[model samples]
Target: MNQESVVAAVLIPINTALTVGMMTTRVVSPTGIPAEDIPRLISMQVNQVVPMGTTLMPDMVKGYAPA
Candidate 1:
């Protein structure tokens, strides 16, 4: 298994749990967001999961910036 496989494995369970939690807690979808859309929901959950950052903040010139 490599990075892609590792990410996939982690993502599967995360999306599953997030979906169940969202349903159980009845979290309201934003005005334009749809609950039944799996891809969008998975993306939302994952943005919470990994996200893009080095924890040093962006404006710092010598820290980190996404390529």
Candidate 2:
């Protein structure tokens, strides 16, 4: 499976995070990440995408909406 499929099948672990966070739509691949390198792969994302706040506002989900 390729990166797109990898992303499509992805389920990030948000429960451990202290606050809710979301990611932007952009994606990039590193030079040499093995299938076993899940932590490294996620860390790259944490270092880049996770910290850089997105310009788009998050869509409201159930139970969190304001009337």
Candidate 3:
């Protein structure tokens, strides 16, 4: 299911450029997280992806349009 969605999201017309995966923690959590803490946990996990004292982004990315 994850692969299906991720592949479709990133390949077909190619949406969600910056995101290879989405809501991974939410989907994989085997039931134990409180609603109020989900957002905090998401940010906590997301923030760990980048190096400390630095940030990241696709600065040179360009979107396409059909003629």
TM-score of each: 0.21, 0.19, 0.21
lDDT: worst 10-residue window of model 3: 3-12
Tens-digit lDDT track for model 3 on 1-67? 3211101111212122334232222222223222333233222223123322122212212332111
After superposition of all CA atoms, the RMSD between model 2 and the true structure is 14.1
Residue-level lDDT tens digits of model 1 in 1-67: 1111112222232223323333211232222222233232332333233222111111211222333
Clash pairs, candidate 2, are: none
Of candidate 1, the 10-residue stretch with the lowest lDDT total is: 1-10
Better of 1 and 2 by TM-score: 1
Error of 3 at 66 (Å): 48
